[PDB]
Amino acid sequence: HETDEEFDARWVTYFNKPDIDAWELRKGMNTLVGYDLVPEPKIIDAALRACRRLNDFASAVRILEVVKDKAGPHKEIYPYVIQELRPTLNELGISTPEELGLDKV
Amino acid sequence: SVVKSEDYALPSYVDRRDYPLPDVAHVKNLSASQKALKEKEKASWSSL
Amino acid sequence: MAYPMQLGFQDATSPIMEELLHFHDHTLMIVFLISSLVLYIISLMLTTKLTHTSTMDAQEVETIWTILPAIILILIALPSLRILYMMDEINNPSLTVKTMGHQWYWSYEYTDYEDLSFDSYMIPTSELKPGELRLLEVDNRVVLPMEMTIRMLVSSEDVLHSWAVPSLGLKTDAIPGRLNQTTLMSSRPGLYYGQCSEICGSNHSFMPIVLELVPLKYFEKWSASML
Amino acid sequence: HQTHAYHMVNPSPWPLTGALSALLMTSGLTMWFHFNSMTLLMIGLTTNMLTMYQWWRDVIRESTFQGHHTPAVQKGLRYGMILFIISEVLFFTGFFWAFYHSSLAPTPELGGCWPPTGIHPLNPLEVPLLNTSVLLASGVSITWAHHSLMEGDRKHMLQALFITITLGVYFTLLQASEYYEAPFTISDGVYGSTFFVATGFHGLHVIIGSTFLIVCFFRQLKFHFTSNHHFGFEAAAWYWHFVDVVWLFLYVSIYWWGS
Amino acid sequence: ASGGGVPTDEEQATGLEREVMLAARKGQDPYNILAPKATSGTKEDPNLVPSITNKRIVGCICEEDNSTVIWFWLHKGEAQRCPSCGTHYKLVPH
Amino acid sequence: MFINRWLFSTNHKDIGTLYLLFGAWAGMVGTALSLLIRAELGQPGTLLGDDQIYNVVVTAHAFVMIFFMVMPIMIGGFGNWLVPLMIGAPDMAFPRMNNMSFWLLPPSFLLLLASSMVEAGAGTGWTVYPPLAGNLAHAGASVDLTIFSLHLAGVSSILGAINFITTIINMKPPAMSQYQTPLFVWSVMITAVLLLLSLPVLAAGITMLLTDRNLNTTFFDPAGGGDPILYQHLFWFFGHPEVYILILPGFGMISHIVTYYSGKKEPFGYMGMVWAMMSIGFLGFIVWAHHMFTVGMDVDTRAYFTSATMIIAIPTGVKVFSWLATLHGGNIKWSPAMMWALGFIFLFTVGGLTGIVLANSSLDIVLHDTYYVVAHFHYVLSMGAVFAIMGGFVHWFPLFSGYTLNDTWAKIHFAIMFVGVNMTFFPQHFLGLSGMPRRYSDYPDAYTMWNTISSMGSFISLTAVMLMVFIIWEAFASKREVLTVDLTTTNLEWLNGCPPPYHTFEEPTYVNLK
Amino acid sequence: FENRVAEKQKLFQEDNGLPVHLKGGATDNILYRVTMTLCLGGTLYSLYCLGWASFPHK
Amino acid sequence: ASAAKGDHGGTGARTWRFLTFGLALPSVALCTLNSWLHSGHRERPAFIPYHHLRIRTKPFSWGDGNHTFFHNPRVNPLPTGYEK
Numbered sequence A: 001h002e003t004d005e006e007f008d009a010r011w012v013t014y015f016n017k018p019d020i021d022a023w024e025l026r027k028g029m030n031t032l033v034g035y036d037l038v039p040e041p042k043i044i045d046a047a048l049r050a051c052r053r054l055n056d057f058a059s060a061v062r063i064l065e066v067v068k069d070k071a072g073p074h075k076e077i078y079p080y081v082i083q084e085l086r087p088t089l090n091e092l093g094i095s096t097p098e099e100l101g102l103d104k105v
Numbered sequence B: 001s002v003v004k005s006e007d008y009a010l011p012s013y014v015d016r017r018d019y020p021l022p023d024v025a026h027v028k029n030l031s032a033s034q035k036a037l038k039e040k041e042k043a044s045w046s047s048l
Numbered sequence C: 001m002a003y004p005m006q007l008g009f010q011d012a013t014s015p016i017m018e019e020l021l022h023f024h025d026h027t028l029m030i031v032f033l034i035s036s037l038v039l040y041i042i043s044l045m046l047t048t049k050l051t052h053t054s055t056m057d058a059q060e061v062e063t064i065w066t067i068l069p070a071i072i073l074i075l076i077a078l079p080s081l082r083i084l085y086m087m088d089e090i091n092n093p094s095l096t097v098k099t100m101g102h103q104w105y106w107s108y109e110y111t112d113y114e115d116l117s118f119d120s121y122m123i124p125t126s127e128l129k130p131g132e133l134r135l136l137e138v139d140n141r142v143v144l145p146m147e148m149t150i151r152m153l154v155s156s157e158d159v160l161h162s163w164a165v166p167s168l169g170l171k172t173d174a175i176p177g178r179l180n181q182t183t184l185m186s187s188r189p190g191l192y193y194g195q196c197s198e199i200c201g202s203n204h205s206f207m208p209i210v211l212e213l214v215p216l217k218y219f220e221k222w223s224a225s226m227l
Numbered sequence D: 001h002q003t004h005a006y007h008m009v010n011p012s013p014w015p016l017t018g019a020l021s022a023l024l025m026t027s028g029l030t031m032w033f034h035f036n037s038m039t040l041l042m043i044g045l046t047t048n049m050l051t052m053y054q055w056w057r058d059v060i061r062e063s064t065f066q067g068h069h070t071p072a073v074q075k076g077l078r079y080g081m082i083l084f085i086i087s088e089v090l091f092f093t094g095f096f097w098a099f100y101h102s103s104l105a106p107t108p109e110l111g112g113c114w115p116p117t118g119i120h121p122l123n124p125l126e127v128p129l130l131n132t133s134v135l136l137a138s139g140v141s142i143t144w145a146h147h148s149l150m151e152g153d154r155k156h157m158l159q160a161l162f163i164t165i166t167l168g169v170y171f172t173l174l175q176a177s178e179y180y181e182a183p184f185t186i187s188d189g190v191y192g193s194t195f196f197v198a199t200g201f202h203g204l205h206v207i208i209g210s211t212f213l214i215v216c217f218f219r220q221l222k223f224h225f226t227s228n229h230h231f232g233f234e235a236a237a238w239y240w241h242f243v244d245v246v247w248l249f250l251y252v253s254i255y256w257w258g259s
Numbered sequence E: 001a002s003g004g005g006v007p008t009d010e011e012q013a014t015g016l017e018r019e020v021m022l023a024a025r026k027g028q029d030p031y032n033i034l035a036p037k038a039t040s041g042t043k044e045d046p047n048l049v050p051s052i053t054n055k056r057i058v059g060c061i062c063e064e065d066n067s068t069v070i071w072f073w074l075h076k077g078e079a080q081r082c083p084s085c086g087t088h089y090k091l092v093p094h
Numbered sequence F: 001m002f003i004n005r006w007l008f009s010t011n012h013k014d015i016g017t018l019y020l021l022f023g024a025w026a027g028m029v030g031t032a033l034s035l036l037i038r039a040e041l042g043q044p045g046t047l048l049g050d051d052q053i054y055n056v057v058v059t060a061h062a063f064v065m066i067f068f069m070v071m072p073i074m075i076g077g078f079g080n081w082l083v084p085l086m087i088g089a090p091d092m093a094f095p096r097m098n099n100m101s102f103w104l105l106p107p108s109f110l111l112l113l114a115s116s117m118v119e120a121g122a123g124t125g126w127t128v129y130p131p132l133a134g135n136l137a138h139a140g141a142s143v144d145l146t147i148f149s150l151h152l153a154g155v156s157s158i159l160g161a162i163n164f165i166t167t168i169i170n171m172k173p174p175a176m177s178q179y180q181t182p183l184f185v186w187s188v189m190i191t192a193v194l195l196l197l198s199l200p201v202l203a204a205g206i207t208m209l210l211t212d213r214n215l216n217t218t219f220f221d222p223a224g225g226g227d228p229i230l231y232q233h234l235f236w237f238f239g240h241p242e243v244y245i246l247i248l249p250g251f252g253m254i255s256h257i258v259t260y261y262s263g264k265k266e267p268f269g270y271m272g273m274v275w276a277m278m279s280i281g282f283l284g285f286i287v288w289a290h291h292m293f294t295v296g297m298d299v300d301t302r303a304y305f306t307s308a309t310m311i312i313a314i315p316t317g318v319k320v321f322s323w324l325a326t327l328h329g330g331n332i333k334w335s336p337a338m339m340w341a342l343g344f345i346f347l348f349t350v351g352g353l354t355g356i357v358l359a360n361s362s363l364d365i366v367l368h369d370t371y372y373v374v375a376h377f378h379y380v381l382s383m384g385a386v387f388a389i390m391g392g393f394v395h396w397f398p399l400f401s402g403y404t405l406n407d408t409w410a411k412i413h414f415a416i417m418f419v420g421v422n423m424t425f426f427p428q429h430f431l432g433l434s435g436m437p438r439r440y441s442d443y444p445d446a447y448t449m450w451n452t453i454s455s456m457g458s459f460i461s462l463t464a465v466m467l468m469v470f471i472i473w474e475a476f477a478s479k480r481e482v483l484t485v486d487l488t489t490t491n492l493e494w495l496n497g498c499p500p501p502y503h504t505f506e507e508p509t510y511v512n513l514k
Numbered sequence G: 001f002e003n004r005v006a007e008k009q010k011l012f013q014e015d016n017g018l019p020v021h022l023k024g025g026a027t028d029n030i031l032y033r034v035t036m037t038l039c040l041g042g043t044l045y046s047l048y049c050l051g052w053a054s055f056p057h058k
Numbered sequence H: 001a002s003a004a005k006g007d008h009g010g011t012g013a014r015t016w017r018f019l020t021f022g023l024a025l026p027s028v029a030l031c032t033l034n035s036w037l038h039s040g041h042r043e044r045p046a047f048i049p050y051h052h053l054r055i056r057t058k059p060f061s062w063g064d065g066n067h068t069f070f071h072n073p074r075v076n077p078l079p080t081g082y083e084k
């Protein structure tokens, strides 16, 4: 309804709430993946740091999986997003699903 | 672990690519080593 | 008559039947197109892993998919109704023929001038002459003059029947106590077949109609000889 | 224990005995029409009356005696009765359609005219007009009964309901006499067919409606109704007005316009 | 002659009909005839959901005129949130 | 306890189970009758050597499939199980009258059996037109037993309609408006209104036929000034609403299935779906004489009925496109119920479009009383109703029973049926265009090829029906008990577990107004 | 007449587990058995009549 | 469209009883007069065996099969004419 930038900024603000709770983390990601888009890196960054404040490593990995899933057949999107997130992944010690072997069937 | 018919009114686990963060953990009961692992998770994940 | 493996209508014998063929072609093209478009859209919806499951606003698209079907219906209705009122338009017949349905045969009355009437029964399969058509031939055909507008009046002396000749585009129910009118004009000589078209009991399948279209002078002499 | 206001009904045999009574009445009519025998039909009529008696008895037990008819339950019964009446209206509509079809387009067999050649209709200004005044009057008196009940007046409710019932009986006796005296019969072509089947089903509904009013009369005598809670009475009155309105359409269509 | 003789509901209603009548006079709704009015639904001011047991189904019409109702069991204990709009509900048993 | 529970029931789930059992049994009878039709027609010549029996088989085929299989399954079975659960109600409004709607059906079916056993049967067509159905051309009890079978089925459904309308209007949570109730509930309410208004007219017409046959009335007999065509009007004034009654609950189940296996919380365009069902219901009362275009009707009346009939495509198209829009963006789960629903959308669309062909009265002169009509309605009615029923049955079997089907077997079953019904009915278009009449026990030789294929098709569907019974047996034989069901936040009927307890919603749901 | 509804309310609310169609007492049971006997007996008789009518003697 | 009467203020039992005795029952009494006054048998017409009347396609399931259910020998002829 608003501009892309305004949408992304609402979502960044949502995940950046310092005392965001577990229910709000899940509600956010489960609502976000309903939209026709792959979330911008800046949104995913804010969600991963929410995971960190909630001491939830597993949900951070899961969020990276759902970015890949939302891209569908556009195989170029997920590697781009991981690229943009590598400073955050390194800072927070978040391994990707591929690094964990969780992309094997 | 073990899901019971008599649990139908409680929040449940599901694996659905459109519901990435389910309402409960897959495993709720933790062994001693699994408890220690959840404590370690409170420190830097680079050390996991 | 129909021929083996036929897919569509019998070839037109009358100008109205020719109208119906072109109108059916028009309508079936629309039918094919809509069916194919739905099948295709179904497959398009079902062939992507991309998702969008949040609420979708409907009012904009519902305009398209009410207005476009309404336009299509009007494109069918206009030629449909034109043919309907053509078929109805006055034509001044030269001849009136009655047919009465019965269990299980047709009788025919040609009483414009003389008292001519006779019964018309299916030829039993065991008595077909070689080359004749099973369940379609009759003993006494409905001889009629070709290239002339004929009024057929249809009734019944027992249960409902229905007098049909597909290649002339004709089907008029035969109702006791009622005299239904239809008109008939064959562009060609020949033999044109139909079958009883309202269930009338145990030999409904076995009371066919055979029109024999010939030049007027042959029809006149035939008529005289049938008195 | 429930915390909604609706009625969970005890398991009951009457649906089954009612369904079987329907089997016995219909197979009984078949036996009567084709095998010259009334036996099955009499059993079916008997089991049908027993079913209706015990079923509606139980509804009174559930409501007056056990208290299950909360306002939500009563509201459902109001809808149910209105819908039942609508279905009966459409049943009569089929017979009016038959009557107008045949009378607006009289066929040659009739003489091409309506009334048919050889049919001498009743004079609509004699007993038919009297029957009209009787049912209209009964619609006034049942309205008096209804207001007396709402105002808590036992004696005048009973008096008005008795007058209403007496008028229903008067109509029925008059109609029976008219049937006997009529010079035409049900076998007198489509005139007799439409006349007797349509007025005949109407007369059956008058008898049904009168029976229902009589049930209400005896329940009133037994103090079942309160000044605010009396849906059986309301339902009987709605049904009674339906019977009155169907009569007015019959009178105008078949007796007057069709004469 | 305006006489009497017809029982009133006060006199003669019985059973559940009488329970509903008596509770209505007290402004109470133990048999759920009325729609409850929402609170603001915050964690501080949750919708209070009466129950005679330790769980009850909530339907949440998240926004006025939504045709989709969101259904879930509400259990005794800490307030729970509608999975669609987040508004809070707390069970008040027994 | 057994008799109390199953003969004296006042429970909407148990009565729904009774209806599903009754409808499944009737479906076997109806299928066997359909195989006899197609065996008679599977090669030229005569198989039964008795066309009165042929006509009896055809007639009973239709009555069984319509009145004893589709309506009991859709309305009595899915309606009773699902409608109270979908609105959080504790049962139906009239739980004891509901049981009589059920128990009138075995006697109704018994009367129809009786009709076929006495004399030479009612070989009339399911339309039962006079004078063929009158007391000279069908002397004896068969047609009267048929009339009485319809009377009992009619009372059954009228009282059921009263029950459903009352339940749906009166027993929702107080906060839930009609525009907060699920589409399947809407579809049942609208079907019930159609039943309420249409069946009394049929009852009137068949009662007039009964009195013409037995009391010397002449409603339909020209000798008394009557008219066979009046019966046709009364019959089809019911019979067109009836075909919408047969599909509307199907539309409702399709909406739920498509929504569910698309992973959606709601169907696309809910108010448009309500509008479309109401519009279809209303227009369904003003089109009946398109069953009568060859009876001798004035041209202006033909023009009106042509036009009014075509308009029904507009709301129907909104439903078809909204189902497509529900799939759009879905997380598609390729469950067997989804396959049934997708097959429904396509085959219903084909049959609806041949119905638009037939609505053109000029073309209907040549197509009326031919196999083109038979092909139209076995797409839109026979496949439409059967595919929605199978979709609903596969989808909700775990709710009703507590057990899961084998999904692989269920997908095999779908595949076999889809091939079978298309092989059976698609060639009947060619037979109709080329002039083969319906209600025939044999055909001119030219028509052999397509009748042969059609009959071979009918045996493939027979194999599917046999496999269906084995699949239900295997589920109850293996006893895989349901654990979790997704999307319960938008499918309230699942939220009390599988199967739900005998009493549900003893404490009603909490829904506030805000 | 006197209003004896309270008495009937006591009777039909007695905590005796009886279903409402039997809760009036022994007479209910008699009328129930008569009805059900007529229905089941009549239904058997109708099946006999179908059997008879299913075969030629017309 | 409300007749020439005219008496509300809060409708009630008293007004509907007034209507019952002051209008409804007097009307019945008047129509009862008018009827049982135009009564007395009329001249039954010549019998003509019209084929659209006295229909018999199947015997009636009572009596001798040839008498309608409320047959009145004075005014209802059989297909062969009036009875003795």
Ligand SMILES: CCCCCCCCCCCCCCCCCC(=O)OCC(COC(=O)CCCCCCCCCCCCCCCCC)OC(=O)CCCCCCCCCCCCCCCCC
Residues within 6 Å of the ligand: C007, C008, C009, C028, C031, C032, C035, C036, C039, F350, F354, F422, F423, F426, F427, F429, F430, F433
């Ligand atoms: C539609 C349901 C599924 C169908 C399943 C079977 C598929 C059938 C085709 C699947 C393709 C569908 C159309 C096939 C028409 C083939 C013949 C024709 O052109 O017929 C035209 C007329 C006759 O007109 C004429 O006078 C011209 C005759 C020309 C003769 C030339 C020689 C042709 C050789 C013989 C052909 C053998 C026929 C096959 C015999 C078929 C036996 C089963 O017939 C007719 O009207 C038939 C009336 C059918 C109306 C229902 C519409 C269904 C639409 C389905 C579209 C979805 C996309 C397809 C994609 C569909 C895939 C799902």
Ligand code: HEA
Residues within 6 Å of the ligand: C034, C038, C068, C069, C070, C072, C073, F243, F244, F246, F247, F290, F291, F309, F310, F312, F313, F314, F316, F317, F318, F320, F348, F349, F350, F351, F352, F353, F354, F355, F356, F358, F359, F360, F364, F367, F368, F369, F373, F376, F377, F380, F381, F382, F384, F385
């Ligand atoms: C499920 C049952 C069902 C349904 C829903 C329908 C739906 C329709 N039917 Fe059919 N019909 C029958 C069951 C049904 N019918 C039966 C049993 C008979 C014969 C009875 C007998 O004689 O025994 C019959 C007979 C029958 C006749 C009489 C034919 C004859 O006997 O000569 C006609 C004539 O107009 C007709 C027309 C239609 C039309 C226009 C619809 C419409 O409602 C269809 C609307 C649907 C669509 C059009 C497809 C989806 C729409 C879009 C994708 C939008 C875009 C489309 C366009 C612009 C056209 N039907």
Ligand SMILES: CCCCC/C=C\C/C=C\C/C=C\C/C=C\CCCC(=O)O[C@H](COC(=O)CCCCCCCCCCCCCCCCC)COP(=O)(O)OCCN
Residues within 6 Å of the ligand: D029, D091, D172, D173, D175, D176, D179, D180, D181, D182, D183, D184, D185, D186, D187, D196, D197, D199, D200, D201, D203, D204, F151, F154, F155, F158, F200, F203, F207, F211, F215, H068, H069, H070, H071, H072, H076
């Ligand atoms: C005070 C007015 C009378 C009240 C009612 C009297 C009896 C009617 C019974 C109810 C049935 C109503 C309609 C039945 C059809 C015919 C009855 C019409 C009314 C009537 O009573 O008609 C009489 C003939 O009755 C006859 O044939 C035969 C009468 C007996 C046979 C009844 C046949 C049963 C028909 C079954 C109906 C099925 C209904 C199904 C509804 C299902 C709805 C979902 C007329 O007598 P007549 O000697 O011809 O002429 C008078 C000459 N002096």
Ligand SMILES: CCCCCC/C=C\CCCCCCCCCC(=O)O[C@H](COC(=O)CCCCCCCCCCCCCCC)COP(=O)(O)OC[C@@H](O)CO
Residues within 6 Å of the ligand: D045, D048, D052, D056, D057, D059, D060, D063, D064, D069, D077, D081, D207, D208, D209, D211, D212, D215, D224, D225, D226, D229, D230, D231, D232, D233, D235, D239, E012, E013
């Ligand atoms: C061959 C002959 C066969 C046919 C013979 C038919 C004979 C006659 C049947 C006459 C109908 C009698 C109906 C009596 C119903 C009594 C039960 C009753 O009236 O029950 C009431 C509920 O209404 C309710 O169910 C309302 C239920 C009413 C339904 C009745 C509608 C009439 C149906 C008749 C059948 C139609 C046949 C049509 C044929 C074409 C009880 O609630 P209340 O009154 O509020 O009381 C409670 C207060 O006391 C608390 O203070």
Ligand SMILES: CCCCCC/C=C\CCCCCCCCCC(=O)O[C@H](COC(=O)CCCCCCCCCCCCCCC)COP(=O)(O)OC[C@@H](O)CO
Residues within 6 Å of the ligand: D007, D009, D018, D019, D021, D022, D025, D026, D048, D051, D052, D055, D058, D059, D062, D063, D068, D073, D077, D080, D081, D084, D087, D088, D091, F093, F094, F095, F096, F097, F098, F148, F151, F152, F155, F158, F162, F199, F200, F203
């Ligand atoms: C050819 C001859 C064929 C003969 C066929 C005969 C067929 C059937 C035999 C009928 C046996 C009837 C037995 C009595 C049925 C009474 C039903 C009734 O009265 O049903 C009521 C609901 O219907 C309501 O109100 C409103 C509805 C009342 C309907 C009463 C019964 C009508 C039966 C005939 C209807 C025909 C329709 C005619 C128009 C086409 C009460 O519902 P329950 O669930 O019981 O209780 C609910 C509790 O809360 C009550 O305390």
Ligand SMILES: C[C@H](CCC(=O)O)[C@H]1CC[C@H]2[C@@H]3[C@H](O)C[C@@H]4C[C@H](O)CC[C@]4(C)[C@H]3C[C@H](O)[C@]12C
Residues within 6 Å of the ligand: C059, C062, C063, C064, C066, F271, F272, F275, F318
């Ligand atoms: C007004 C009503 C309800 C809206 C609501 O309160 O939510 C809506 C629901 C369905 C709508 C209709 C359907 O979408 C179908 C038609 C679509 C056309 O674009 C306008 C007319 C059209 C006939 C619509 C008129 C109107 O907007 C309707 C009738």
Ligand SMILES: C[C@H](CCC(=O)O)[C@H]1CC[C@H]2[C@@H]3[C@H](O)C[C@@H]4C[C@H](O)CC[C@]4(C)[C@H]3C[C@H](O)[C@]12C
Residues within 6 Å of the ligand: D097, D101, F230, F233, F289, F300, F301, F304
């Ligand atoms: C079909 C029915 C007559 C049934 C009968 O013969 O009993 C008649 C009665 C009223 C008719 C309608 C009314 O005459 C009004 C319209 C007149 C128009 O010329 C045709 C459509 C039109 C809408 C008619 C269609 C049809 O002929 C109707 C509905």
Ligand SMILES: C[C@H](CCC(=O)O)[C@H]1CC[C@H]2[C@@H]3[C@H](O)C[C@@H]4C[C@H](O)CC[C@]4(C)[C@H]3C[C@H](O)[C@]12C
Residues within 6 Å of the ligand: D155, D158, D159, D162, D221, G001, G002
């Ligand atoms: C006995 C009873 C008194 C009230 C009560 O029981 O306390 C009275 C009051 C109203 C009376 C009825 C009404 O006056 C109406 C009827 C009048 C008739 O003249 C006698 C019977 C009739 C049906 C009366 C019978 C009986 O005397 C009733 C029923």
Ligand code: CUA
Residues within 6 Å of the ligand: C101, C102, C104, C160, C161, C162, C196, C197, C198, C199, C200, C201, C203, C204, C205, C207
């Ligand atoms: Cu004659 Cu069919």
Ligand SMILES: [Cu+2]
Residues within 6 Å of the ligand: F239, F240, F243, F287, F288, F290, F291
């Ligand atoms: Cu139709």
Ligand SMILES: [Mg+2]
Residues within 6 Å of the ligand: C162, C197, C198, F294, F368, F369
């Ligand atoms: Mg026909």
Ligand code: NA
Residues within 6 Å of the ligand: D146, D150, D230, D234
């Ligand atoms: Na009142």
Ligand code: NA
Residues within 6 Å of the ligand: F040, F041, F042, F043, F044, F045, F046, F047, F441, F442, F443
């Ligand atoms: Na054959």
Ligand SMILES: [Zn+2]
Residues within 6 Å of the ligand: E060, E061, E062, E063, E070, E082, E083, E084, E085, E086, E087
């Ligand atoms: Zn919410």
